[PDB]
Design a binder for this molecule. Structure first.
Ligand SMILES: C[S@+](CC[C@H](N)C(=O)[O-])C[C@H]1O[C@@H](n2cnc3c(N)ncnc32)[C@H](O)[C@@H]1O
Ligand SMILES: C[S@+](CC[C@H](N)C(=O)[O-])C[C@H]1O[C@@H](n2cnc3c(N)ncnc32)[C@H](O)[C@@H]1O
Ligand SMILES: C[S@+](CC[C@H](N)C(=O)[O-])C[C@H]1O[C@@H](n2cnc3c(N)ncnc32)[C@H](O)[C@@H]1O
Ligand SMILES: C[S@+](CC[C@H](N)C(=O)[O-])C[C@H]1O[C@@H](n2cnc3c(N)ncnc32)[C@H](O)[C@@H]1O
Ligand SMILES: C[S@+](CC[C@H](N)C(=O)[O-])C[C@H]1O[C@@H](n2cnc3c(N)ncnc32)[C@H](O)[C@@H]1O
Ligand SMILES: C[S@+](CC[C@H](N)C(=O)[O-])C[C@H]1O[C@@H](n2cnc3c(N)ncnc32)[C@H](O)[C@@H]1O
Ligand SMILES: [K+]
Ligand SMILES: [K+]
Ligand SMILES: [K+]
Ligand SMILES: [K+]
Ligand SMILES: [Mg+2]
Ligand SMILES: [Mg+2]
Ligand SMILES: [Mg+2]
Ligand SMILES: [Mg+2]
Ligand SMILES: [Mg+2]
Ligand SMILES: [Mg+2]
Ligand SMILES: [Mg+2]
Ligand SMILES: [Mg+2]
Lengths: 377, 378, 378, 379
């Protein structure tokens, strides 16, 4: 069978919004680790609207945070369709509803109730070194490489907006090759399409995709519209939380529907999904399964989860029901437990808002620190 | 194992946005079936912002469409925190990028290119009469029931914002029961929690959930914060395309990340996901599989898909690669082919923007009209 | 001849905007008296947009200030068309341009430059005890009376939005009577027009206007479209700085065009118009003229005014050249000096933003503490 | 004595707002001459918000009108701080309240009610050929000149945002000279202050201001903070109706407070101020006074003005009681009549939204076609 996963650069309008949302979250947490933040960002031709519900003792400069974020992304001139230095920054930030907060923050700190209801999924598969699905990891690297080539001036005619897509060929449940690649990138008007296609293939795609998976029958589509000068917020509206699949496992695993960026750890949409990646990775790391997918769910203002489910796809190396009640022993999945487990009350979330929340070494939910102590029990 | 799906009422802030987006799409398509529409809606305390990229010959009243939509949902008074008749309606609507239209609308009509790149999933499972996963269909019915009991005045203290969550117990791959239920609903200040919990238990949950699946160990969580007076856009920002899982299969199937509402059929994020539901359902209806999950993908401005994948979870009733072989013969999955297959150039999409896009008889992608022809060529 | 002036209530949309701008200003100055503030507010159905240029070390809660200000005004329910508790509050506040600031905050505070170029008028007349023109005085009193009988419950069907207008008859420079009165007020649907008109007459108009100026020839126009249920920002957009004649002299005197509200005192549009009122009032209180109009002008970044003019309409008691010299001697009109002269670096401005900036004698620019000095020096 | 007036260029943010509001009005009136339009515009860094109350059968492209208007003004690049092609255009346009409209559009068109209450002034003076005060005339000419030499490429480092101010010396009611001139203009970073100041002197100030009014005593203030690179909406919020003295008589005459731009002629704030200029100009052109100030006032939903006043500052050549009678005999100041008198139901307003509503004699309220009639009836 064929399988396909996509990713987007830091300049894609939805990722701009995600990044602004987590930039504001970060600034707040630097001052107020216990702040309640639900930051939703809307980006369109000429304007950033930052809104949502925040309850904090912190004082942050929404305008300067936003301009700085768009500046680092690279939109700094009207020729690119968007300029960090001259766009509108609007705030529509209110307070968190008192009807919600009475369910989260309560008497005993360890009794903290879930921020909301909802379902979250985690996933891990041994087919890569970082225990991630291959299609989404190489999609991320393709767009991450585009931004690095753009920023270090190797291809100065590049623009921030870009998307990648890769369609892998599988057999025996293992990678055979790559049947199709797509790399669409915004560009200045100076460069013709033929020069751009060759530069993308040589400088973007070949350094990232192992040539074994590439054949003469491997199909390539580079700016297949034939022109990508208009881009960023000018050609497409950007919204926080509209890339939740490229944020996670590229469609290789199911999703509960919860967005990540702009949300402080009290939101189980984020903190549970990180903890679900945490256990599913460790479970694989201990060789107890080849592939593992966890589903947890919560009720509003209720500490204990309402559902836990371990799925091994017929690859378990110990009975599945032993695997389930071992998750329950070595991981605390109540809201207060998620935050303690992963050391989450820190400004570490802007770095997550582009190129995937999962599969990066240093994230606390990526550490394989309980791998050994899984076997022993 | 236990599996959990959720859904939200038409009054949930994200669904308000989805509904406004598709309400605008509908008005446009009624005048201009060929319009290019990408309508993104942002709703917060006191305001609706309608934005996006539209290229159309149609003239529509964004303000009145929006107020009328919020009216029908039920926010018609400041006591509820939001009033269709006095909120701000802002428009930030631009034109579609010329660099994209040159890849969609090109030369031959049947050589039309995909609206974007992306991946889309479809799904069907025989475990319900409408071939949908059970958790998401009963989730949808719980909030759909909440809106109907609110609107016909049986529980007049109900307010439009509501959510449901059901935890099903599976084993043998079959439904054992329901281990947990959640029904959070916005309410007037008149009624206390005990009275509300009883009324929700009696008028909401019991008429909808088969009593067999309820035991006495079945947990019930009703307004578990203890108060749900503040609600709608006042308590929670609402955005178009932020309920893509409750829009589809409640997490039972994978998702490609594409939102549906506010998008005209030239966006493969919508029309392909509808066509993948179409083929995955008809495949099950022909008895060729018990459960079937389809993945297709496209490259922007390219007619033919870049990937097709039929996954039957080991429940196939014919060889797997003959099942992929037949999808490619009796279904045209190029952009123009999707639209012809399902007759999508019609104002039918507002009805989809709440209570699921899948599992409702009348949608063109729910017809079981190729079921027999798939068993023939099998 | 006939002369007409108008005023508007604290609930008129433009005055809502002025009051929010100056509420924000006051909140900042309480923490940072030397803040640079140019706060512009836009109010329309369902939303308040607070924008402008602010450089300050203060932190103020724009949302809470706005809601509290709109609450005090009385818009607290969707039936009124606007609700302080559920409207959107958006911010678009930037920083003051450093290109402007280097001209204002120079190294030497004594050389503080004018915050902009421009011209400003001050006026006084011994026609009333507070040395204001009579038409604007009584126009303010009518809308202040409307607000009082609304707020104290006398006429609870009144809504916050209202306007007044009075046409006076003059003969040989003296008021002889009132020729026409207009009073428009928003109201609930519960009251019919004829009953409203009688109540406005008895409770608003007759207690405020002197009876000896009202005759059988006086025309009274009360809600003369026949209906005023829709009002506030729903019926009419409100913007800061769009009531500058109501704010000053009601058309009796000239105006240089600069708005007041939302501006810190380094904006000479505000501080130099207060100073010009101060010198005009003190000239008339000193008995040196019956009527006095002062023009002053500035260049941005320059301390010394570009012009000063004293106009007394033939009423002067000492030569006009003497009066102009007395103004130079007794008043500092450089920005540093006038801010110190009037003690302007305090949170005193929200109070000015409805019912007129002049004629209320606890304002520092209304003190006549230089009148005896001027009478002596002349 | 000294008297001062100011003006602003088409690129000043308040004037950007006035021009967008009147461009919207014109686009609507081209399709629907009887539309009810109250279009209010707010411009700040990166965004234009077009709002207000409009009832019309026209459809106009608000975005395209806004972008085209800002392009014509000259903000077309982020280096300038504002870009017509990449700024946000938001709409918050509602409908006119039917409670207002039932008072305006009554069954009998002759009984058309005033769009609001309010007071309006008109003014004329034989100080200049167009019968306007000299200070606002020359202040307008300075910023018009700034825009001209920016636009024709003479001084290409000029940017659109600019302001002027002139202080005239009067002696016995005549201009004797100019005491001070202010000219502030946004500019690119490529030019230094002293070079800019000399270029502004030579190319903007000296070709416009009479040389006999400029002496060694005249003070010249050119970009007196020392830098004006940040400008336009980035430096200063723009709002419709925040230049109403620049729009009219530069402070020489009184004002009733109503803004002009974005309003259709049923708003007497605009149409009755145009009418008041028309009757004042015709009185002075008829030779019946040297300067003349008219006040008119209305009640909302009422056709007959609540007051009319004729002030001639002692310069009248016939009794002031007779002048007021001539005004009532020769001018119709009811809303129906004044809209007919000045033929106001046409897309003519965008042109008014910068460089002043008065003094430009192709406008219909600038015609002196009643002066000879007034001259006859007075004797
Ligand atoms: C703009 S498209 C979606 C279609 C759009 N909403 C419309 O109005 O039709 C979404 C993404 O595709 C990318 N994109 C935009 N223009 C493109 C072009 N000419 N070629 C390839 N990719 C493009 C951008 O990263 C953009 O965010
Ligand atoms: C708690 S959530 C998201 C968290 C929120 N953004 C915050 O500020 O923390 C809000 C959503 O859940 C529902 N909700 C809001 N308040 C609720 C309450 N007291 N009890 C149960 N559900 C509530 C509403 O449908 C609303 O859309
Ligand atoms: C909150 S900060 C002051 C913090 C700063 N570190 C200090 O104390 O000097 C004030 C700046 O942020 C901007 N600002 C935006 N919103 C503001 C708000 N509600 N209150 C105060 N300043 C605001 C203004 O441009 C203002 O100059
Ligand atoms: C609404 S009117 C201005 C014209 C209006 N914007 C339109 O669309 O025609 C301006 C002010 O007049 C007052 N007003 C509103 N409705 C009124 C009514 N029905 N009768 C009398 N005055 C009214 C309110 O104070 C309002 O702010
Ligand atoms: C009614 S018109 C469309 C004309 C239509 N044929 C009719 O007669 O009803 C559009 C209405 O929506 C509002 N509107 C919003 N945006 C508009 C726009 N760009 N152009 C004209 N009207 C607009 C106005 O209140 C206007 O009355
Ligand atoms: C920006 S200033 C007014 C006060 C300003 N809002 C503040 O924050 O202090 C008003 C007008 O003066 C002009 N202006 C802006 N910057 C200027 C500068 N550096 N020098 C001279 N004039 C300037 C522009 O026409 C601007 O619209
Ligand atoms: K208005
Ligand atoms: K006078
Ligand atoms: K300003
Ligand atoms: K005069
Ligand atoms: Mg998107
Ligand atoms: Mg969610
Ligand atoms: Mg949401
Ligand atoms: Mg998508
Ligand atoms: Mg107004
Ligand atoms: Mg000013
Ligand atoms: Mg201004
Ligand atoms: Mg007015």
């Amino acid at each position: 069978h064929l399988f396909t996963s996509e990713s987007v650069s830091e300049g894609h309008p939805d990722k701009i919004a995600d990044q602004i949302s987590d930039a504001v979250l970060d600034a707040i947490l630097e001052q107020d680790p216990k702040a309640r933040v639900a930051c939703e960002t809307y980006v369109k031709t000429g304007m950033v609207l930052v809104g949502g519900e925040i309850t904090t003792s912190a004082w942050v400069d929404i305008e300067e945070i936003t301009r700085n974020t768009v500046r680092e992304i690279g939109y700094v001139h009207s020729d690119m369709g968007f300029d960090a230095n001259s766009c509108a920054v609007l705030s529509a930030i209110g307070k968190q509803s008192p009807d919600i907060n009475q369910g989260v923050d309560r008497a005993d700190p360890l009794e903290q109730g879930a921020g909301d209801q909802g379902l979250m999924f985690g996933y891990a598969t041994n087919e890569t070194d970082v225990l991630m699905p291959a299609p989404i990891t190489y999609a991320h690297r393709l767009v991450q490489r585009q931004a690095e080539v753009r920023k270090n001036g190797t291809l100065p005619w590049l623009r921030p907006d870009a998307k990648s897509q890769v369609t892998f060929q599988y057999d025996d449940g293992k990678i055979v090759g790559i049947d199709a690649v797509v790399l669409s990138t915004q560009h200045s008007e100076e460069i013709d399409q033929k020069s751009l296609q060759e530069a993308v293939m040589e400088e973007i795609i070949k350094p990232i995709l192992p040539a074994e998976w590439l054949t003469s029958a491997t199909k390539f589509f580079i700016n297949p519209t034939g022109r990508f000068v208009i881009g960023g917020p000018m050609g497409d509206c950007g919204l926080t939380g509209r890339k939740i699949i490229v944020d996670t496992y590229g469609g290789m695993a199911r999703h509960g529907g919860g967005a990540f960026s702009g949300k402080d750890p009290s939101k189980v949409d984020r903190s549970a999904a990180y903890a679900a990646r945490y256990v599913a990775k460790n479970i694989v790391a201990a060789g107890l399964a080849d592939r593992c997918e966890i589903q947890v769910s919560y009720a509003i203002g209720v500490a204990e989860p309402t559902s836990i489910m371990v799925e091994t796809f017929g690859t378990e190396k110990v009975p599945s029901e032993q695997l389930t009640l071992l998750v329950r022993e070595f991981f605390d999945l109540r809201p207060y437990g998620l935050i303690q487990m992963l050391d989450l009350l820190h400004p570490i979330y802007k770095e997550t808002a582009a190129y995937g929340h999962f599969g990066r070494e240093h994230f606390p939910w990526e550490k394989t620190d309980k791998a050994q102590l899984l076997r022993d029990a």
